[model samples]
Target: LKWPRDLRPLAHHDLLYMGQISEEDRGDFNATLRNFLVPRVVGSQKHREVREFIVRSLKDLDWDVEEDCFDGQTPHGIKPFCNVIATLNPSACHRLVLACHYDSLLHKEGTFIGATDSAVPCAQLLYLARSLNGKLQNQKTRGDGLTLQLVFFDGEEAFERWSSHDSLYGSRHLAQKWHEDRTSAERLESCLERSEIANQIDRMEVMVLLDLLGAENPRFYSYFGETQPVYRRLVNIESRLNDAGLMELPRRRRRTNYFSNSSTVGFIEDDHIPFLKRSVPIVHIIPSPFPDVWHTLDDNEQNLHHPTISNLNKIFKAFVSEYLQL
Candidate 1:
């Protein structure tokens, strides 16, 4: 991997406000979550609406945004998909990509909101953009080589069953597209030594994918050995937040450690597969065993724990700030 950025964790004072999710902030988080809380199967009207919202939100924050649109064949039929890509500083040669899938699973029965399945992660991404936009802009003034890129993949859920061709429709397409794109080479023209770097995919320092979150007591373990160091940073951030009483857990609930020091060898299949296959180091933030409400109709907002979500948001805020050295 390329040398780490001169990492500087945000100080306790900088983290204090992140934990203070005010009433308006909580309302805003729920408002964003409610936008995608519905069943948003790929190609559906709801899916299109959610996609537009995400694009609009990022654009409103002044980030450079693009929509990677295409159609994919599924068990049911061919469906159109779009992956939302937003970059804080498009000219930057390297990216610390944060990603999550926005499409909900297609079920023949009742409505499946897929709240924890991925809606929460999507909401968190939006919150991060809004919350960290100022810091990112400040970093832009330094003319650093790295920028934060947020990716929202569509059609991650298979129409019928989870299969190679059936799942990750958006990510697979985007990954391959980025790998072959010549524009990235053009963007890297200023680099003094760029012979070994081929394209955009090569410049990805790490793709941290967040999924199956928004539920209480998420247990995050380091999946890839290469990313354990970065993962440990997350553990450290969480501990520091909790110790500072900055983790907003439910009342009477003892502050618990969400990140585990232990590691898991194999990883659960998700949107990062395409990038990982292309040799991109990935930090998969999906919890092990997933939430019990996974894939069920009960995976709705009703099951989401607000305090836990607030805590996680603060943790991610600190973690990303440190990673981007903002």
Candidate 2:
């Protein structure tokens, strides 16, 4: 079954039981948050440490990791900006990207924990990776299901202020590279022609960029109407997953739908912008109203809700499972 970048989504099905979040998964997620909650200001040693941790984690999963380093001219001078790309099936042409910004910013008050803003979502991806282990279709699919690609973006937050050039340095750099590489077009030499491959490399069906999740009472609405099917699929099954104790997902209100519209909060400037500009269909999973602790030093574990993330875990895991047909 082929899905265009964003026209329609699959028929909505009941929420699934993608299994509950284990204690060990919780420990790993929390430990990561506690260890790296400091302001991971880009270009700092802390940033490098965080990058190493991501690479090592992916390597431990036995997945191939690529360190995409570059020098994007910023107010902080031309320092190294690293983007961690981890792939489950590196050779697959059609792919699905799960991305989030790992770097946290600081406020004048103190270090910004950025737990809900992104830390938990990043860890959530790891859990998804572990759960999907050996389940990926890999090269044997014969160009069937989408390959999973996890991207940890550095320099998502601007040093001084949130602006065009300063923010999204990592995504901007990588999107252009993917476009230039055109690797999505690559296939066996005996297969597709070079002309057919020109537009192939890095072909992503949908780049689901998760951010600002895990806050208590987080009404994570679907901002882009184009990806409503993706969001709707999750909405439909939350009840079933929760019923099975696999998730503590939020229940839909009477007459209230789970997925919101594009007009909810207008356009959110995120890491998805770069890829969206490159025509990579983006399914942004972010809430409408910015969380109370957004960009503040208060965005820590205390401010983030455990069940909300757990709910997100099963929902996303199930969503990816259905999307990948595994």
Candidate 3:
């Protein structure tokens, strides 16, 4: 905790009843999207502001926040980066990590806000936090089984070009650090120690990274062998929501499934690579072939369709809540 300097438990107000997801109050999704939709390129003023916003937002929910701040060497030079790790209950042995990069791509031309690139993914995480805050709190009080850990990684974009050394600054740093971490086990209570987890990385049940989302009819394929079942769970969630008339389906065209069982293992380079190298089971929720607006200036707020964003939010909320059994 001391090494991570800003790591600590935040105090949250006790709720009279557990929070339930309601269809009437869906304003927070778009509200969060509007809040940090700017270009948050690494080391920029907007970058710092977005990080602060995420930290402040999570802290408000009483999640334990760890601002894993560090400086990484880039093509631009050594730059300051911080990965925000918000834990619903820090003491839980098994953690389900939902993550995305908060930084936008650095373009030589006009500004690129990366709304679909990752801004939507980041906003979705905030929406998840706010929607599930009360239920998560109740889960903690009852003694936990699985806890949610939202990781907003910084510096996921390449400075000039996409390459091994130029990309994933924050993830590479955090992965190596977490790989070497042995102190996290000490924070666990005796009941949580029943599992044979040796270090911090072992505590991660699976890392589900959402990237290049919020576009219309985006398709997701099963990229990894071990996590296909988890991917199918998301597919099932969407289907159930659709069948129950909870999802806002497209009226002009026949309904299409966003998740695929294609068996294609094409992997897009993103924040999950470092963790994957350490043998972390990952459920990558990135659209295949990339979005058309990816890396373009047009990847701004206009391209982000409201209904598509809202539907993905519902699926993700269902996934997280169902996974955590909150």
Candidate 4:
């Protein structure tokens, strides 16, 4: 916990460039949850609709969105898929990625709307982008080259069941692509040097993955051991904000046990796999024991508490502002 003397004072900045999170933001998050209501099964129009929505939102911020499209084999046959990556500054050599899975689940009877499953996190990513609007202009303002990369991965849910190939389709493909880009100069077109690839994998400040949020009674514990410092950063931010009377989150029994050093459910098969394999430090912002309506049809807007999203909005806002020193 040593602040190293010099860097300690840098943490106390008021982050004056921002205002309090607005109700309009919460309304937008709620609207996104309701908008992505129907079953967004893979290889369907609805799935693409979700991806387009994310693209439009990021484009409105004047940031270029690079769509990584590829045809990969799923159980349903070869389906066209896309992974959307929006960068704050594309020319930056390194990236600090914040990500979420936008694709919803398929149900047997009713439409499986994964509200807490991922819809909220996707919305949170948008809000996070807007909240950090001041610092996103360039490394000139923040004094760091690390640009924000907001990734909305397609085909995150398993086409059949959760398997190595079935789940994380977008991530596996992209990670492999990034890996291939590292090896071939003809592919990257001299954009990424051999040493740059080596530095990039290690250059990520933290890749924050938000999932299973927006539930009524949710608690986020830093699941992975490697991202403990990343997790502790948020915990500290949340505590500081809570004491500042900024969040409606009263003392609930929702505890974050950082001692486990493992996911509450053993290992979560989210989109972080590819990055983690490539040695990127990861911070998973998912619940320990998932919500009651985890993958069910009941995981709709009904389960998405406004205060939960609002508090998270505050928490993430505080996280980015302080983390980026905005």
Best candidate, lDDT: 1
C-alpha lDDT of all candidate models, in order: 0.84, 0.70, 0.79, 0.69
TM-scores for every candidate against the unseen true structure: 0.94, 0.84, 0.89, 0.84
Per-residue lDDT of candidate 2, residues 53-158 (tens digit): 8888889887889988988888767867899999876666556789998888746678777887788777787768876676663433546534788998888888
* Tens digits of per-residue lDDT for model 1, 15-105: 6655566788788888888887988988789998999999999999999999999977788877899999999888877788999999998
Candidate with the greatest TM-score versus the true structure? 1
**Which residue window of length 10 is worst by lDDT in model 3?**
1-10
List ranges where model 3 is wrong by over 4 Å: 1-24, 183-187, 190-194
Off by over 4 Å in 4: 1-19, 32-34, 138-143, 183-196, 199-203, 250-265
Count of clashing residue pairs in every prediction: 0, 8, 0, 0
lDDT of 3 by residue, 32-63 (tens): 88877898889899898999999999999999
Task: Please list all clashing residue pairs in model 2, or write none if there are none.
Answer: 15-237, 182-201, 183-201, 184-200, 184-201, 184-202, 185-200, 185-201
How would you encode candidate 4's per-residue C-alpha lDDT over 143-178 as one tens digit per residue?
344467888888888878778888888888877776
Angstrom error of the Cα, residue 156, model 4: value is 0.9
| Model 4 worst lDDT window (10 residues) | 1-10
